[PDB]
């Protein structure tokens, strides 16, 4: 069951964990082998997993798809995520999700090591990402909704980088560092 | 809101399955009536389950016909002996 | 492999015998044994295992029985069933139903009570 | 003796097909690749 | 064939051949998740006909 | 891939599908980029195009991809290197033809 | 010159059963008895005892299955086999192969578990 | 062919028991390290065998403490004479 | 190829003395005799075979050393140990380890006070051994 | 089998890899002990081996016979491949197969070192020759089919020298150099 849960968390929805385009990742049904309270807790973790899946979908939407060659590259950034800043945003998001992927693999290995471990151990171990991911998802959704383009995206990230969540602060600092690297590269080219 | 997704989805799926089963049974009953098969809901359900379980339709049909003939012979014997 | 708690073929056959005969399971034991023997026998493949061929055969048989309305109703019900996609073995159910169709005009040859004579 | 037995190392190989004894079980290569003796048996 | 069959049992199972290789696996819930899921499906929907599924090893996959 | 297969053959350590997918993740990303670039450079070229026209379309696609990956920065380094190698290889015959024309005065 | 100990047809059939079932000879005793009963039964002569006629029938059957390429391949392989002359009973082997051909288009009628009841 | 399966399985079980004992001893060593007990693997194994051999835990604890004090006194005597 | 088997106290004590003193058994004969005399008349019928008391004591000690994270790790380790069925006398092993435990803080280099409390444990003496 | 496979690649056909004068080296049949994907890999390797075998056959056909001192050397060129340039071509082909033979010997040493190696390692190691040999085989087949004679064969080699495969280009340069050495020897005698 843990392997299936991780696969859903790894982006492979199954018969237990159903993905809904509208609702995101959800537990598909009541399983006879789970206590309903255990089902409730698992779905509570599945909320974080759903956010992760939606983040991965966004990553594919903005970096995984070929940029339509609309002659005016400035407007490609509006409707579709496009622009070097958009690529930097996607790269930063993937870099921030890399530690989560590593933690998920470590959890899988640990659960493989000890058959007496329960899902509660994962819920403990994964709670840090259950707190981290929602804020970054909100920031990304704001970027998408405001159609931030070019360096104006950098300004928005800076404004969001001043958040109060220390882990969110560090993650946004990493993203801002990548964006500033892109900005500095452009500035280098100009100067 | 997080916890609710498994049981709620399970309930919605069960309701949809029940409605689909009802629709299928209605279609099957209409087909049986048009073909004058003489099958009732319980017998039709048993036949459907057997076919889903892989029973040969020719064997199943022969068995059903033989059982009906045996039931008619037994009813005739019971009516002649009564 | 999602095997619905399908009560054993023996239990299903017993339920079928009880329903058809209108008698309890205990009264159909000889008939149950006969059914088990019949079901266990190797049967030749059905004449048609194609849903569309079975539908066409059903339509032709209904037209031959002057049931053209029943043939159209059968074709429509078959289309609806195919679209519903609930049944896994449509060909088997269609073949069974076709094989079990009875012409209402041909007076059922009432199984003579005489078959009981050899049971003793 | 338990402590002499303690100095035994065991395989770290695990599988998600096994949970009751994850001491490894040697996937056992196949199609050539089991070496000369298996190839001779195949021949 | 007996020596060859013994090797064939010990040289990795013919599962890659259309002959069904049954392999022993742990029945633990975490290890028998496929079997437990099949059991739940079998328990949940009376219309569920079990499809023939080929069991493959994770290493084999 | 051969190194992964060797590690699988040794069977000494538990290798899971997730572990393999993660190991191939950089390679999988490079493969996705290469697939898109190849589709644009070759697959998008109409079959009836003249070999000169096919080549020019491929070359322009390569140049545009190069610009895109150079603007993508450090995260595309493996992809940028791949694209640079592709460009160098594709220009090798073209540069050779240019060299032959310049040196021998004969366009072969 | 001691022609390799081609074990008697009963032993060969037992080995074949063991291979097909994937069980030892001791585990197929009932199946061996069934095989002996089948083999001792009188079988009708094959419909066609002509190698070329059998090849043509195979090609026609493949065409009926919309396998025209497979029909051509079968005719070519049959010509090659006839020319090779290694097989003494070409007509019998062709009849066997025809009997063993399977239509890929016909969805396998999943043998109901009930067939096992008669296996005992 | 039948008989060979038992001895191989028994040997595998013994090896698994050994690995489990090793894991347990590792856990105990980790516990000692967190607790800064100062026991080495051989000493820990000897103590484990003694407790497993039925040594009275109050007696075992007192004996261990006395032995540790004696070992420390012997090490101090060896360092004073060196 | 060693199978776990009950070996006489003399062999175990000899090995223990050898490893503790780091000398041959001939060189620890006096110490061996003293230990043998003390150990030879000591059966603990008074020890309550209850792991929970030992675990609680260990937790309290860890808290005293400001090692709450280590206490959690110890709890998890105890859970794993219970999961494994290698040890039968866990109460004895835990009691021995706790008695032989040395505080890393005694981190630091000493421990604040030793106001032993009445808390303690059970006396088991109640049974007719 | 790996030794047997190399022997087939070394020109010793066996029961699995049969050499057919018409079909070349081929996998004899589907065996029950291999996955069909392994059968496909084996068939690709047998394709490479078939090409090698055909090259060796050509080498024997045009180089393997002692030169009959038929008084008229000019007529040898018509039916049979003949001429000093033909001998140089065969020598070049053998020299190009020499590095392939060396690589095969290295593969043999590796397989002797590790009995657990699979066909994938060979396919990796031998892929360079799997690319080299088909092009040279095509060139040789063109020479044979067009009955290129004398120094006119050199012109075809030049045409073949324009190939895109860098290794094929280098090999054809070596062959052309050997043929030019012979041509220069004749030219020296004349001049």
JSON list of C-alpha atoms in Angstrom, two decimals, chain D residues 11-15 26-27, chain F residues 8-9 11-15:
[
{"chain": "D", "resi": 11, "resn": "UNK", "atom": "CA", "xyz": [22.44, -9.02, 1.94]},
{"chain": "D", "resi": 12, "resn": "UNK", "atom": "CA", "xyz": [21.02, -5.51, 1.80]},
{"chain": "D", "resi": 13, "resn": "UNK", "atom": "CA", "xyz": [18.99, -6.50, -1.25]},
{"chain": "D", "resi": 14, "resn": "UNK", "atom": "CA", "xyz": [15.30, -5.93, -0.59]},
{"chain": "D", "resi": 15, "resn": "UNK", "atom": "CA", "xyz": [12.18, -6.20, -2.73]},
{"chain": "D", "resi": 26, "resn": "UNK", "atom": "CA", "xyz": [19.45, -13.36, -5.43]},
{"chain": "D", "resi": 27, "resn": "UNK", "atom": "CA", "xyz": [17.42, -12.30, -8.50]},
{"chain": "F", "resi": 8, "resn": "UNK", "atom": "CA", "xyz": [20.77, -4.82, -11.29]},
{"chain": "F", "resi": 9, "resn": "UNK", "atom": "CA", "xyz": [22.64, -7.98, -12.26]},
{"chain": "F", "resi": 11, "resn": "UNK", "atom": "CA", "xyz": [21.47, -7.96, -7.19]},
{"chain": "F", "resi": 12, "resn": "UNK", "atom": "CA", "xyz": [23.39, -7.00, -4.03]},
{"chain": "F", "resi": 13, "resn": "UNK", "atom": "CA", "xyz": [21.24, -3.94, -3.28]},
{"chain": "F", "resi": 14, "resn": "UNK", "atom": "CA", "xyz": [17.53, -3.19, -3.39]},
{"chain": "F", "resi": 15, "resn": "UNK", "atom": "CA", "xyz": [16.95, -1.17, -6.57]}
]
